[PDB]
Design a protein around this ligand. Sequence first.
Ligand SMILES: *[C@@H](CO)CCCCCC
Ligand SMILES: *[C@@H](CO)CCCCCC
Lengths: 293, 297
Amino acid sequence: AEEFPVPNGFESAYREVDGVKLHYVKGGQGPLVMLVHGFGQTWYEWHQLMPELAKRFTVIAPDLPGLGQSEPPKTGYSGEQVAVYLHKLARQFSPDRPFDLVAHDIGIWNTYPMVVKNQADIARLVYMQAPIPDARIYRFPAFTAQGESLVWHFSFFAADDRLAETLIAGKERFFLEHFIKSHASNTEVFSERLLDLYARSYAKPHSLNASFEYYRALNESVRQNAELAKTRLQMPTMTLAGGGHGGMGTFQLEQMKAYAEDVEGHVLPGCGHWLPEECAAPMNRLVIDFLSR
Amino acid sequence: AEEFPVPNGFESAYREVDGVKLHYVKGGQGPLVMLVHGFGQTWYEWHQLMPELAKRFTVIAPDLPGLGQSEPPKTGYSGEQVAVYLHKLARQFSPDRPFDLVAHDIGIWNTYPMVVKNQADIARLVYMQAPIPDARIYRFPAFTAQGESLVWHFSFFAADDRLAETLIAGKERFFLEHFIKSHASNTEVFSERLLDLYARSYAKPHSLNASFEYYRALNESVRQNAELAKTRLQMPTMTLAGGGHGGMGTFQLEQMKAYAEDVEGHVLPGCGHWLPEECAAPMNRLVIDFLSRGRHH
Ligand SMILES: *[C@@H](CO)CCCCCC
Ligand SMILES: *[C@@H](CO)CCCCCC
C-alpha cells in the first residue's frame, strides 16, 4: 500500500515523466508549490507543512526518482538529469504560471539546474540544509576535534564496489537511525514508528541503491553546476539552516549569496539538519510567510 | 597457531608487558630494529623486509595491542598509552643500547609518544604513510574532486554506537579488500590469497573492535601530542610516502619537518599507501640503506 499516511484532503498519485513513473502527494488550490525531499526521507517529511500551505496554494510533494514510490531515473542521477523530471512534473500542473519551489538536502542538488535554466518558471525559491554542489564542498573536513564530521558520508556513499549498499543491507534501520540522530539537535521527534517508516522505504533494494547513486553523481553535478552558475538566480530566494548540531549554520546563506541577487536567510538556533521535523513550527512559519508575501 | 607464515629462521613468540600478552616475530643478530605495522594488517606486512634486515640487525615485528595475535591493551588505545607497551617490549630485547624504529600508518600514532619521551633510546627512525596525530588532521577534506578522500574513514571508524563494527561484522573480507585497494596504486599485489590472510585476522571480534578503538582515541592522541611536540626529535629520521593513488605525497615530509631536526623524505612514484607490498624493492632498499648508516652486524 502507501508507504506513508496521506493527510486528509490530499491524494497519492503518479505521473509518467519521460518514461519514469513518479509518485507524489498533492492537495490544495491556487498557485503551485513543489516541495522536494532529501536523503533518508520521502515526500512524507513535508506532511506537517503541506496542510498549512494547502490553505493558499496547490501543493505537490514528489518522491525523488528511485526513492519512496518513484521509479528510478532512466537517464541518470546527476543534478541536471534529475531536475528534468522534477521540472516537467511541475509544469504538468502549472503550465501557465510560475511555481514556487522548496527543497531540502539533496532536493537542492536535484532542482538547482532546472531553476537556473528555467528562471521564468520559478516564482519564489526556498532552499534548506545542504550545499548547492560546487567547489565549496571540497573544503568540508573529513574529521573534527569532537569526532565524526558532518559530510564524511559524501565519500562513504560515493564509494564504488557498492560499499554503502553492501555494508548497510540487513542493517538499514540501524544505519538510518544513527545517520538521522548524528545530524539532529532534537532527536525526540524521531519516534520508533517514524524511523520504521523511513527505514522500510529506503531499504527497498532499488531505493537503497538510488540513495547512494545521487552521491556517486555528485562530482558530475559539481562540474555541471560550474557552467550553469555563470547565470545568477533572479527570483526571490530564502535559505534556512539549523544553528544546532547537524546544522549548516551561516554556510547556507553565505553560499546562496554567490548564486542569488535577492536572498534572505535564517539560522534556527536549537535545530539541526531535519528542519521540517526537528523544528516544524518555526520552519513552517518562515516558509509560509515568505511564499505568501 | 600462526595467523601468518613465519619467514625461515624467525621465531613467533609472546612477551607479557604490563599485563598484556604481545605477539611478535623475531630474527637476526645485531642491534635491534622494531617494525610496527598499521591498520588492516599485522606484523606480516614486514615479512619481505625482515630477512634482509636480519642480516645486519636483530629484527622484531610485534602485533599492535588487540590486532594480530596480541591481546588488547589494558590502559587504553591513545598513542601515549599504547606506546608504553611497545617501548617496554623493545627495551626487554635492547635494555642497554638504543634501537631503531620503523612504523607504518597507525604504527606512527602508537610510537611517536615513546620516541619523543625516550629520545636516547631511539637511534634512527623511519615513518611512512600516516600523519602524526595533530591539528593538521582536521584540515583533510571529507570529499575530493578527483580520486577519493584519504581519511574520511577517520570519522567512520570514530563514530559512536559501534557504527563501524556493526556494519562491517560479517563483511570483514569484503570491506578490507575495498579499503586496501582503494588506498593502493599497485592493486595487483593484493591477491585474494593475501587478502584472505589479513581479513581472517582482523575479523576476530576483539580485533575488529580494537582496530576502531585506535580511531576513537585519535582526538585524545592529538591532545597528548600538542604537549609532547614542544620538544623536537633529535635523532636521524626518514619519511616515506607513496606518490600514487592513496599516497600521502609531500605531506609526510612536510609535517615531519615540524617534528624533527634531522629528516630526509622520499615520495615513491606509482606507489600508494601499502609501500612494503606495492613497492617492496625501492622501499626495502631505502629502509635498509638508511638504517645501515648506523652501526650494524
Ligand atoms: C543530506 C546531504 O547529504 C544530508 C546533509 C548532512 C550534512 C550537514 C548536516
Ligand atoms: C591508516 C590510517 O588510518 C590507513 C589510512 C590511509 C590514509 C592516509 C595514510
